[PDB]
Each structure stands twice: as C-alpha cells, then as structure tokens.
Amino acid sequence: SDFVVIKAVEDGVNVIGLTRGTDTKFHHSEKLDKGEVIIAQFTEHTSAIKVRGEALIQTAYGEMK
Template identity: 65%
Template sequence: MEQEILTEDIGGEYVGVRALEDGVTIIGLTRGKDTRFHHTEKLDRGEVMIFQFTEHTSAMKIRGKAEIFTKLGTIKCGKEFLD
C-alpha cells in the first residue's frame, strides 16, 4: 500500500538564505528511501532566496559564507564562523 504524504504536514516551513560572498551554493535533497540531489542554486553576495520544504524536498545543503533564517533563529555558515 502506498503511503500518502499530506502537503499541509510538510509544507509551510520556509528558510531564507542570504549570501555573504559570491558563489554560495544551495542544494535541495529529496525525500524517500534514497536521498538524492534534485536542485542546485548559486547566489552571489547580497542575493537572498526563500525556500520551502515540500513533498519533494526534505533537506538543504548550503556551501559558502551565508546567513540562514528559520523560524528557530538565524544561523551563519562558512569556514570563517568556525573559529
């Protein structure tokens, strides 16, 4: 029997990403038994993108210096923030 995924249960979770340098990469990862890359975006410094988790997107990988805005707060990522 195929399991039904309700969009209301996984939709509505938004994440904002602001690039703090050129070439920040955002990779969307799929849901399901095998996690795979399904979408890639590149942002340059100052660009902002808003993402939503969906029935197809379960995770995001962000590479580069950026600020990530979620309902839980703000996260800074990049090697500069590790020290």
C-alpha cells in the same frame, strides 16, 4: 509549510535541494552571489536543504551566521 531564508555573504554560495523519500539525492542547486537571497520551502519533493559557502540563514528557530 516551513521555509528557510538564505542570503549569500560572499559570491558562489550554492543552495542544494535533497530528495524526500527512501533515497537522498541532489535534485537541484541554485547559486547565489553576494547579497542575493533564496526563500525556500520544504516540499513534497524536498526534505533537506544543504548550503555551501558563507551565508546568513534564518529559520523558525532563529539566525545561523
């Protein structure tokens, strides 16, 4: 399954999972400080991912700075 790579360029970046289904709610958040990385899949329960704060993002479609 598809995934995203998220690296914090500054402290306090939040990576938020949004629920799959008829409803769209916050189900989990991970905080990244500068330099920390999360590699996160889309899953049965997560169909959208929100990132708050300055991050470097890589997906199958390229880089989002």
